[PDB]
Amino acid sequence: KVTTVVATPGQGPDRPQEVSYTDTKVIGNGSFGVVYQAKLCDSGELVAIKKVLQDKRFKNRELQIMRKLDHCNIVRLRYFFYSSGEKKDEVYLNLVLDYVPETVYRVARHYSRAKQTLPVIYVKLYMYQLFRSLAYIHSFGICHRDIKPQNLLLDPDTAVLKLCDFGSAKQLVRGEPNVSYICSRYYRAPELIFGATDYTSSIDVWSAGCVLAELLLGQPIFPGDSGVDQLVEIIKVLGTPTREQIREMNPNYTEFKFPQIKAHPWTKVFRPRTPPEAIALCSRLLEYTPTARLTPLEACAHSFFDELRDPNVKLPNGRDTPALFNFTTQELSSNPPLATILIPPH
Numbered sequence: 001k002v003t004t005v006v007a008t009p010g011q012g013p014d015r016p017q018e019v020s021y022t023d024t025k026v027i028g029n030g031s032f033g034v035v036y037q038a039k040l041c042d043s044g045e046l047v048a049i050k051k052v053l054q055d056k057r058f059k060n061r062e063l064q065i066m067r068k069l070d071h072c073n074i075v076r077l078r079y080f081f082y083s084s085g086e087k088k089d090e091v092y093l094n095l096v097l098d099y100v101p102e103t104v105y106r107v108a109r110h111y112s113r114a115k116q117t118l119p120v121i122y123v124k125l126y127m128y129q130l131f132r133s134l135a136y137i138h139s140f141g142i143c144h145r146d147i148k149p150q151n152l153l154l155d156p157d158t159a160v161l162k163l164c165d166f167g168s169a170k171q172l173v174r175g176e177p178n179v180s181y182i183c184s185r186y187y188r189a190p191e192l193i194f195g196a197t198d199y200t201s202s203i204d205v206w207s208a209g210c211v212l213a214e215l216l217l218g219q220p221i222f223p224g225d226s227g228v229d230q231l232v233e234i235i236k237v238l239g240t241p242t243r244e245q246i247r248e249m250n251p252n253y254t255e256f257k258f259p260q261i262k263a264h265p266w267t268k269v270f271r272p273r274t275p276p277e278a279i280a281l282c283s284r285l286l287e288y289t290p291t292a293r294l295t296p297l298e299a300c301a302h303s304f305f306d307e308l309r310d311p312n313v314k315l316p317n318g319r320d321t322p323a324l325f326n327f328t329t330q331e332l333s334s335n336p337p338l339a340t341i342l343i344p345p346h
């Protein structure tokens, strides 16, 4: 019935408290372990509890990263605690996160199975908030490395998006190599596909670009069950990466045989109804050269999102838009003058 734990609050000083929850249901499995849902007895609030085997030598990287994240577009770590259950003698870490009822993945698939497109206002809202969460985590040097629709939480009532699953997230340090095999099918940046170990946070941006494209197309823009098929799909849109473009990602994948194809016009990729600002944003996200891709903040400032900056804009359900402008010094640090655009007169 009721489970009572002594859990450490995610934020502030390490001062644990007796927390009680009930109504436990499984809502997710994964290589990481299990995600439960539960109801706090104190507030009646719903939480997701992510339970992962804790081993054993060092501190859990995900926990360390989530404890220092505080942002309206990032899933909130309310508590964490340790327990048993399964394995025995092996210890588990439980992350107690504020529950969010939907995902971009589930919402997009509703539209896709109805053979309809998500209305562009939602694309703008969701994409903008995704780029904020990225601008934020990148300001600490943290790369998410698994940006995909299922890791994008939504409250359908308020249209707030929250980035989750920091299971793959890492603090990227120049010159310290990182595993190339992160990030999920369709959303992998071409340098990851080429197995680069010196990649940057701009892989998060490529993935976001793939998410944007998918929301406009109603299906993944770069499908394929292997790297070589994805790469073909990318080359069909972007053209063949030059010897230099290859070099800017390549562990020398120069000299290899790539299908030669000229850059297909980006306007021809989407429905004719698709706003040009949407397409222009895509072509600035999905670039071969990682440094040529927009930074998350610059993307927030893109003209595609101007409607979000209209004082008269409202949600289709009649309510107001979430707080889109409460930028901090931290968030703006990669380009402070962009504040002129990011924060509208109201």
Ligand SMILES: COc1ccncc1NC(=O)c1ccnc(NC(=O)C2CC2)c1
Binding pocket: 027, 028, 029, 030, 035, 047, 048, 050, 075, 097, 098, 099, 100, 101, 102, 103, 153, 164, 165, 166, 167
């Ligand atoms: C599968 O979800 C995850 C995968 C990996 N790590 C963490 C999470 N999940 C989360 O962190 C998480 C946090 C808060 N709410 C949800 N809600 C949902 O999933 C509803 C759509 C059902 C998931």
